[model samples]
Target: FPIPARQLFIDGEWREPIKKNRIPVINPSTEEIIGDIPAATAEDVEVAVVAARRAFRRNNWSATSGAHRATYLRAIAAKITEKKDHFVKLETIDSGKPFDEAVLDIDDVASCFEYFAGQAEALDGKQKAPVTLPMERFKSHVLRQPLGVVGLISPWNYPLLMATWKIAPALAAGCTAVLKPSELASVTCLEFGEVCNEVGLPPGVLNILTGLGPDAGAPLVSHPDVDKIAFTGSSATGSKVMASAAQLVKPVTLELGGKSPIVVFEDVDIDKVVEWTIFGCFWTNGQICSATSRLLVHESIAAEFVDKLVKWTKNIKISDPFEEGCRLGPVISKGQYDKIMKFISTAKSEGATILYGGSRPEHLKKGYYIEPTIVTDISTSMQIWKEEVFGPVLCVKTFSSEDEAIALANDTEYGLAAAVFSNDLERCERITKALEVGAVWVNCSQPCFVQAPWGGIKRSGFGRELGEWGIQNYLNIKQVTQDISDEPWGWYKSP
Candidate 1:
């Protein structure tokens, strides 16, 4: 299959950027420029926002019933399922993730559309509800209305999946949106627009703008006509987005960075713990925002756990993303690879020990690959322990007591996700309640379901993304009050 057209998707049509500039789409696995995408600027952003506003105000989508919108959503889901292989290959080459992992992501993308389709139908029942009041003559009810013209900015790691997390719910709630995917990995998202087009989604209901963050993303955040902004990226950039939205008093949902922790108890199965540990920190090549990069283990089991983890980490295959049996692939770009390398070098300089892999694999020399790193003997103050590397780097620390483990895990400013492993059900339940994060996994890590809520408190960013809360993010509530009695003005001298 050929790459999709390298143009912006706006108003249900493929159009060139006003500036006529383009960004190269590189295959990180081979350092090859596989395609190019139109570099949308502020001019394109204006067109998209205008189209979205018209779609919302003109009743092209907002006026439609929930069941009607669901038909489009389900159609998109079916179309994506039909093109799963195409997407799998596109995602692998574009983002440099392993082929099998890319397949799982594409599958989940389809399921997300399907999940939100059901939510769209269920939204009909939630539109209106009676509200009790004190006065007998007064009757009150609440109405759920769609927030108009949302701006969605997704990151590069999960590309289409992250975009769908915002787009599916926004459309499901009847809000027209303009999406700005990260330029580093916009191929799959651009293709997603094709899926929407094939499904006959209304013009301007969902638009895709592929461009640099400063040019397209900044404008979308500050656009006057946009009612809401949903952004997922670094904490620093998310702050800027929030500040810009603040100027307009517009609502925003931010899913930012994390330095999450996985706590393993001495009573758990060591082999199972190691598997979850690797999957948690190294899945998606550790590009996940909620990656469990910090490991806190009971002191008694720390030595054996580290030994098994090191052996397993060394065995992971690092090769071309499309190669069979490949477990880990390259980081997304040269910049990301350099950043991860800097973190590793700085950790060593700061007296942290590299217990296992920490550099590029010796045999493969062309791509942006980093060995799955394991850094031990880390303190709370080290930058490697405190900051989000956003790569396949895991830091380990030992705790002598449960209280100590909790303290170590919660020391970071982030509160996105945490994992606890133990056969003792009571301990798992206790630690789950004690952890200060949005999502907690027991005896496992990084297993996300579309039915559950996802997001973090504190610096990890506010608001939830998945599940029912995701749809609610694009809706606003209004109360309607009516006077049943005819003598409403009796007390006002009958004017």
Candidate 2:
């Protein structure tokens, strides 16, 4: 009732926001106001950055070795795991998902830290010059050093889990971080700061700020002390972050939106396609960036597959997005709710038929529920097909051949991720190479590994997150060159 005592995390203490931007949390299932969060102001963002910069430049965290950093990451993971239920409940209320789904997200957050711990130890620098170069008298090698201050901006989709996707690797690489979580879902990130403190993350090493993109995120990235910026959200926002980082020529990792496609060829399992497609579109209420949203069906089997897809959408059940067996949930907000409604309308205008469930179900008067919809006859250029609606709306477009499918799939600005459902082994290999995306999943959708590279291309953004690639973003390599035998190679005209 007291606004849940939420605070911005700076230098190991709980701090309040000056603006008092009250975030009214809602349950999508019942449309009930469940909780509230404070709006962090511009000054509050400055405090978080100052704290992080202070810790990085003056504190012992930057001086810590990789092995020791690994221990800290593991400790944070353990703390999250220890206070597991508290996180789960808070997250459930914030995201309006069922308790079990929130718990799974917490598990993911913990595993992220644990997985990054190993990557910390695996960070290595080389002690040799290139083979083309002569051996140096003073010796030549490269040393890996931590980026001084990292600014990480994560989105609302999977608040805590996504935050760790940035925080864990930055810390694992011995860099101090100032994290700004989505104002739409800021609670879990604020709670995460407590875990960091309890696990001995030195004050200033980790800072959490709450505010919108302009106030908190833009200023944080542009701050003089911030050396590297890591972001996960829409492509437009990612572009803004990069622009700010460019002011000081600071580096950035941009994990942006996707127009990811799924190719289902003629030789695939019908039931399996149905299962994977539903799983892909509806995971996290279809808020996932790398979700397989586009169905690039081969024209040869297009008629049969579209019908099956329609039936598949009908089987899904909408409720609290967080609950177990709750196959569908609200589409994040009413604005997103309305945006999706417009997309469905646009699909109809583009000659697509409402093959199955395509409207908000009346059974859900309390929540922002939309029946999982399937639309066939989607043109390649339709907004629903090209843009990211980010809801439980599926777009199906037909292609006559493998080449045609690939051509249609790769036509967008995004190349984040895509999938293929085919029983033919040869087709799988060919399709995998043809898709212009970072990840190519065969018969899978949106399953991310903490130990593998995760990022997108084209308009989907650049640089990789997770695994060794993630830590590399925060680690810099420097090579030293020397003259061999203290001899000047120039002709000794003086002699």
Candidate 3:
């Protein structure tokens, strides 16, 4: 349960930063500095990148068989499972999410590793596929090989879980990685290096660099030796990451921002619809990139639905994340708290109505806490409706018809996720198809499976993660052709 060694993991060893600087990690629930991690500079990144490159090229990792790699992946999963409670506590304290939610995150983290272990084993069978070509004598097949060293940048929201989403697949595909986790919440990720080491993972196969974006992340993105980049964060930052990677023309997978929508039809049960709507927007302290912060309700039931939603929102427990019944916790930091407060103020100034909780709870005096907020009378032109707040803020609007609801939901610049609630299965099906998002929920929301494909279209960012696609993100496909005929015709001799 103690914080992992406050050092960088380079070349499978815990070492000090080149600059000898440290970044403080705050416990958001109490606004206290709990620990500090090494502030890795570009020099440190250079060391890690070189290590990864060596591992990919000289070490036997990339050449290792898929079934062999599965053992390592499965061992990592077992180690994580063995330390589940410790990790759950670390996650809750570092990310300020409720303990129960952190438990779920740790569970999923193990599942992700286990899931990718299976994918790694299956890769052996999928590595070579025959391709029929026009020439009878030339037989061709495709070979899937590991891309070289990759730079993986994970966000602070889910911390270790998000890192696992990238790390598990990257390693499974036999690509070495230099993971740059968000400095704000890098505790568990640093500990993950311990798990990797405990499993006897090959040196430089997976490295951890904890530092500021400019210090560590930028260099990794621009490092020519890094073959690819996978980033999860705000859209603005994602753009910068992409631009940096563009110079090298490196492959990148980005999971960015969203102002996703939840559609409610009149025929649905009010209780179930309201619960899903709340979970969609309010879960994870509303820090999820795919949080359905925008709600589109049928005009006939709008008033009643909003009323019930307001009541439920008010009753949500806002306290220390460690409490038994805590449902909402503090935002990640003071900057985030100020940003959410400004959003509420801006909504009011823009003539939007606050239907329910908008400010911090009166009982809790400290910490970065924001009450579950519901903003009604919002239009598409309003910033609150279009932009991602990444907080516990929900914007509600009504639609006269199904077409109107779909239009409203799809109006945003983001296409991460959406949910449609309706008793009529046909209507749910139609609306889910019509909604312009990568992932859709018919009657529920925010339920992600490692077996399912996850990512978004449009500005929500490109490249899918999870399932088979996740592993493919770290693989390179090459076509191999062979002369099957005993005697080959020579063009030069014929001429």
Candidate 4:
């Protein structure tokens, strides 16, 4: 379970971390310096993209037989599965997410490989008719082709797994990639490159670099060699990245942040609702891009739900991610820690009641830790309600009617995900359709699948990163035409 000795992976080799500048990776709970990875530069990104383009254009990746690609993908998955513990531990040290979550992430990463391996074998052409009458008489068909030189920018929350999600589909579909995992948790992503090389993937098919967004991310996205960019991060940054990519007309898959809500009604089990809500947003210290940061409750049961929520929030074991039963961890960075604090301060000033944790515990020191918090009487107009407080802060408010609850939930510009905790079959069906989100959960929160499409509307970002749509993202349709007769049906006679 040792950290990777090298960070950068380009042209099928493990190079040292980004040169000249190094970012010190730290353990969140103890604030200990875990290790360092390359800071990366624009020049480094250019090199990686060039490597990817070479693989795409000159190599046999796209034109390689589908069965051959499937073998390589399956081998990579098998290797990762054999050493799951090592990766699970590395992700914990690098990202501060609980080890249990890290293990699940590893499994999900392997599953993506499995899914895409099968996808490669299933590549088939669909029958089509040509535009002109004579050619249409012969067999015309459409086939899927790979998009060249994909740029993968994954987020910190699920570092290794998210990268795998993008890379598996891209590689399976014959596209080469340059991955820039988030600086906060880039170690496993770096290791993933080693794993790819160890599996005997081609020299330039998969290249990885770590660095800042502007220097590393933007250049890669805007690079003329890059055909598509798969990004997962905050909405504010997604906006900037989208704007920049538009200039080049580069395709992008943006998985952005949100202020998703968990709606609780009067007749529901308060205890169950509290448990679900506590785990939904607070599991990763509310750092998840799809976290349900807002909780909307019926006024009749608002007091009861808040009480259970506060008690559970207080009882959550906030400790090192490696520790057993450590369900909650620190916010990812000092800036996020401060943002959550500022939001709590703002809610207090706006006349909302602080129902649960609002400050750091005195016993813990040094690391970026925040209390799993909840505030009552907060309105939808409040900053905490509309914005993504990527920390363990939840704002609860009363809605007199189901219509009001739905209205408040849909008020935000983000439509990534939401949940409704209601046992009433009739009302549940009604509200499920009423909630405007990409995915809705009933009696739960934060459930995602490899077989399902996941993306948001409005400001939450565009395109998808999972399921059938995932494979489709890495491919393009090409129609092939055949001539039925030696003479064109109407070429000489047509106008």
Query: What TM-score would candidate 4 get against the native?
Result: 0.94
Residue clash pairs of candidate 1: none
Give the alpha-carbon lDDT of every model.
Answer: 0.91, 0.80, 0.91, 0.82
Backbone clash tally (model 2): 4
Clashes of each: 0, 4, 0, 2
Each candidate structure's TM-score, on Cα atoms with residue i matched to residue i, is 0.98, 0.93, 0.98, 0.94
For model 2 the local lDDT of residue 245 reads 85
Cα lDDT for residue 72, model 2?
89
Residue by residue across 1-495, what tens digits does model 3's lDDT show?
A: 456656899988988999899989898987888779899999999999999988888647898988889999999989999999899999999999999899999999999999999999999998779899998989999888998899999999999999999999999999999999998899999999889889999899999999999999999999989999999999999999999999988889998869899999899889888988999999899998999899999989988898889888888998899999999899999999999999999999999999788998889888999899999888788889888999999999889988888899999889999998988999988998888899998899899999999999999899999987999999989989999898947766653
Model 1: lDDT to the true structure:
0.91
Candidate 3, poorest ten consecutive residues by summed lDDT = 486-495
Residue 290's C-alpha lDDT in candidate 3? 90
Between which residue pairs do clashes occur in model 2? 97-321, 97-322, 98-322, 98-323
Ranking by lDDT: 3, 1, 4, 2
RMSD in Å for all candidates: 1.2, 2.4, 1.2, 2.4
Task: State the displacement of the C-alpha of residue 287, model 1, in Å, after optimal TM-score superposition.
Answer: 0.8
lDDT of 4 by residue, 385-470 (tens): 87888888887777898889899889999999898988897888888899888888888888788888888878888888777778
